[PDB]
């Protein structure tokens, strides 16, 4: 072995530390794994010089490599595909670090004092707080503080936090800055689920930054896409980020996690997947995993199939720093480095804080029952605050007097919280003018100079200008008429979903693509400018989503929470795939207002209808949304006309009420020649929750001849009306319930009273008997209106375990059976 061999071995040894040094780093404060701690070189090569461009001794290369990668920080970065990102990390991690000042060390110790005094109070004063204990993980408080401080050092506007329950009240008091009089007002509680806002002031700098905490259910990680949507709405408002004039992304998401949930919940990977998308990016999220190496009673070997709980973050080439929770200086240093990386590259950074869970998962849990080895080790562990104070004395960083000052400060914080809580205990029109319709029609033909329209798209543009002036406005254009007029009035409109720009049924064309250059044109964006050239203040933000339901619906819900003034619509490819977002629907959309006072105006567009395309292309599960509904929680509709859908959307965007809207939208009814509206229906009408046939309101129809009343909703009305016209059946009338919830009790009663000779009333639906509106209407209508619906019968498909048959032939037979029964 010559010098050439020794040189080669040194280069490979350098690469081995950079790549795999993290596998030998002293990251675990419990040291649970005994066996945890290139070889062509020996002791004789230690003082030999090697090219690095300077010549360095092997012992110096080794001390730099060991300090950078094998101490209390495990660095994973060589999986990153961008070489400039690898160099940036390598240079900051391999340089000699400046020791913190005494004032910085004392400040970190002051945050450990605050975190431990809060935990000590929480565990002593109340029973049932063990499940929320931050004991063994208090270092997360100086870590989060360093994140927020570093964001303030960059002069950013706000840090928005999402986190599970563990240490939440400690974060409210010591990070958000909420006083104990507000935190301990009642006697876990709703307090572990509510949102909050506060102001963070730098200790050593000149800036302030807003700090907020979003609301969340107990469902671990479900809030992750909600936080991103909320941050993105705040960034769009501040004219920062993707849809802003600056590239600062000055609203930062700070996302906290547990080790078992971070690996097990699919919504994590769905949310990471959004990190660099044009429609969803927030300029990089700062993640903190509180890695206590346990999940209730479950060991990490039963929770994940990889070395680290953070390995899913490699999905987007994010850097990952595993840091020892017993070293608060390294924890604060990693936090500042994470923020600097996020600012330089606009990409997620993951901090894996290795720590422990001092207590059992909850009250009455002796965790040594299932993890005796771990808890025999934890019973010998001294706290973070005492260990750090002792480290500072031993290093000579602080005197014994200064350590006494710190213990004094600690006892004073402990006295303060115990005494404060003790004293607290003993104390508009939706119609637009013709000019608006024409302008939105004209916008579809106001193409940029030399734009080449696809020959199949050109008739759509020309038909819209034609409809705007002549009428017979179809469903797809009425939607764009509603969104376009809101933009012209100054509203921000965000529309997204799978293939939503063009539309699943090739009906929308909200974005059109140049046949020769691939250039995009958005006709509705022209409505953001008044005829005089001044901006209206409005905007059209239309995107194709990722192929996700859970993260996409969660993002749109969060976006609507972040900007109550925006019109926010999410569209399912088919309503049948929205069950993929069931956790978001159950935990945020349908219930957030009642549980947390958190309001959302999000719209869900669910393509729905029996057309013979199978059980996954037929239903948005109307029955499930109706079951979730309670007075004032949501508006649920199934409009049958383009103009009534237009009025519904305009009412939703202009009512000054924050309440989700669920719309069951059409598929074949988009091109049904009878399902078109007149210009007058847009300029001289409003949203009608109950509709009659045009022969009674506009024609020469006789309502006194009617003996059989058919109540329905959706596209089946047109088939019922076609059979009625062919068979010339004046004895039968069809009434449509456009607004399914809240039930329009008053309008329904007034409409039914115009038919004094009805002997029998039937609810007609395409859906099986256990589905559609019948399970709720069948029960509620006779109770709510007994003089109108006592004796109401059902006409539907038979009850089924799936939304429909898989056969289009069976569908057709069943569809003809419903019409034959309705007119039998």
């Amino acid at each position: 072995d010559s010098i050439e061999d020794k040189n080669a071995r040194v280069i490979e040894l350098i690469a081995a530390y950079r790549n795999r040094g993290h596998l030998m780093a002293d990251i675990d404060p419990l040291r649970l794994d005994n066996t945890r701690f290139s070889h062509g070189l020996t002791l004789w090569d230690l003082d030999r010089e090697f090219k690095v461009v300077q010549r360095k001794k092997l012992r110096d290369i080794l001390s730099v490599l060991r300090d950078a990668y094998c101490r209390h920080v495990g660095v994973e970065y060589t999986h990153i595909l961008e070489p400039e990102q690898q160099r940036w990390i390598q240079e900051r991690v391999e340089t000699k670090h400046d020791k913190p000042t005494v004032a910085e060390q004392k400040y970190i110790l002051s945050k450990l004092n605050a975190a431990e005094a809060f935990e000590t109070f929480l565990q002593t004063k109340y029973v049932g707080q063990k499940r929320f204990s931050l004991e063994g993980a208090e270092t997360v408080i100086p870590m989060m503080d360093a994140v927020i401080d570093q964001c303030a050092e960059h002069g950013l506007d706000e840090v928005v936090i999402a986190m599970p329950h563990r240490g939440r009240l400690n974060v409210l008091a010591n990070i958000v800055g909420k006083p104990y009089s507000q935190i301990f007002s009642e006697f876990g509680d709703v307090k572990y689920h509510l949102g909050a806002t506060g102001t963070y002031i730098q200790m050593f700098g000149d800036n302030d930054i807003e700090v907020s905490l979003t609301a969340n259910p107990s469902h671990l990680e479900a809030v992750d896409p909600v936080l991103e949507g909320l941050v993105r709405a705040k960034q769009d408002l501040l004219d920062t980020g993707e849809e802003g004039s600056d590239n600062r992304f000055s609203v930062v998401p700070l996302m906290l996690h547990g080790d078992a949930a971070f690996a097990g919940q699919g919504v994590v990977a769905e949310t990471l997947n959004l990190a660099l998308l044009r429609g969803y990016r927030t300029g990089g999220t700062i993640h903190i995993v509180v890695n206590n190496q346990i999940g209730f009673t479950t060991a990490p070997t039963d929770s994940r199939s990889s070395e680290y709980c953070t390995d899913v973050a490699k999905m987007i080439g994010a850097p990952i720093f595993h840091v020892n929770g017993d070293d608060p200086e390294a924890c604060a240093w990693v936090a500042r480095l994470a923020v600097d990386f996020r600012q330089a590259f606009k990409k997620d950074v993951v901090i894996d804080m290795l720590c422990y869970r001092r207590r059992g998962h909850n009250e009455g849990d002796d965790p040594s029952m299932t993890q005796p080895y771990m808890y025999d080790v934890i019973d010998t562990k001294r706290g973070s605050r005492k260990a750090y104070t002792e480290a500072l004395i031993g290093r000579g960083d602080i005197s014994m007097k200064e350590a006494e000052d710190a213990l004094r400060d600690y006892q004073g914080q402990l006295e303060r919280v115990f005494n404060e809580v003790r004293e607290l205990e003993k104390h508009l029109a939706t119609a637009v003018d013709k000019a608006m319709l024409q302008r939105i029609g004209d916008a579809h033909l106001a193409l940029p100079e030399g734009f080449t329209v696809h020959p199949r798209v050109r008739p759509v543009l020309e038909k819209r200008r034609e409809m705007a002036y002549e009428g017979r406005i179809d469903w797809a254009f009425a939607e764009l008429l509603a969104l376009g007029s809101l933009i012209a009035e100054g509203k921000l409109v965000r529309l997204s979903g799978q293939d939503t720009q063009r539309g699943t049924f090739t009906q929308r064309h909200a974005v059109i693509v140049d046949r020769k250059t691939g250039e995009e044109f958005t006709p509705l964006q022209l409505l953001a400018t008044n005829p005089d050239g001044t901006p209206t203040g409005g905007k059209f933000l239309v995107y194709n989503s990722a192929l996700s339901e859970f993260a996409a619906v969660g993002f749109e819900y969060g976006y609507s929470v972040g900007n109550p003034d925006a019109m926010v619509l999410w569209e399912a490819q088919f309503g049948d795939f929205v069950n993929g977002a069931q956790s978001i629907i159950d935990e945020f959309i349908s219930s957030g207002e009642a549980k947390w006072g958190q309001l959302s105006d999000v719209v869900l567009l669910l393509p729905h209808g029996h057309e013979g395309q199978g059980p996954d292309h037929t239903s948005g599960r109307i029955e499930r949304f109706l079951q979730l509904w309670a007075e004032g929680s949501m508006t649920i509709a199934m409009p049958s006309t383009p103009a009534n859908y237009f009025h519904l959307l305009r009412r939703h965007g202009k009512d000054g009420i924050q309440r989700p809207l669920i719309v069951f939208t059409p598929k074949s009814m988009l091109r049904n020649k009878a399902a078109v509206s007149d210009i007058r229906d847009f300029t001289e009408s409003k949203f009608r929750s109950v509709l009659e046939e045009p022969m009674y309101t506009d024609g020469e129809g006789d309502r006194n001849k009617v003996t059989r009343l058919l109540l329905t909703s959706g596209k089946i009305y047109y088939e019922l009306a076609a059979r009625k016209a062919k068979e010339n059946r004046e004895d039968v009338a069809i009434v449509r319930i456009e607004q399914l919830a809240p039930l329009p009790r008053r309008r329904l009663a007034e409409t039914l009273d115009r038919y004094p000779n009805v002997k029998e009333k039937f609810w007609v639906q395409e859906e099986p008997a256990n589905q559609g509106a019948w399970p709720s209407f069948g029960l509620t209508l006779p109770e709510i209106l007994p003089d109108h619906f006592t004796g109401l019968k059902r006409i539907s498909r038979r009850a089924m375990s799936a939304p429909s048959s898989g056969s289009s032939k069976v569908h057709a037979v069943e569809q003809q059976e419903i019409l034959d029964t309705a007119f039998g």
Binding site: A103, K106, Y107, L109, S110, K111, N113, A114, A173, N174, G177, P179, T199, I201, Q202, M203, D208, E404, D405, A406, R408, D409, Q411, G412, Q413, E415, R416
Partner: protein, 97 residues
Amino acid sequence: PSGSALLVVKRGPNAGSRFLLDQPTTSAGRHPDSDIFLDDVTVSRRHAEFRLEGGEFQVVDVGSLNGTYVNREPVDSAVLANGDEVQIGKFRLVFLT
């Protein structure tokens, strides 16, 4: 304000608040019985004292964890001048004659 001084909070949760200095010793800290109650976890229970002896107004740190600064400089004790900025935890107070 004859021979007295004023402390005005410029940075902190109570920005705009004014404290009068006219007693021989004026305590500043997180204890609610402090003459100047500065309610932030960065402030120690017993943190600082504003001492008036003769004509000079002095700030003295009484064993706080995060210390006391006068015009961005750490001090154990310092004679205050008109327009000086005193930092007690995250609070910034301006001293005025």
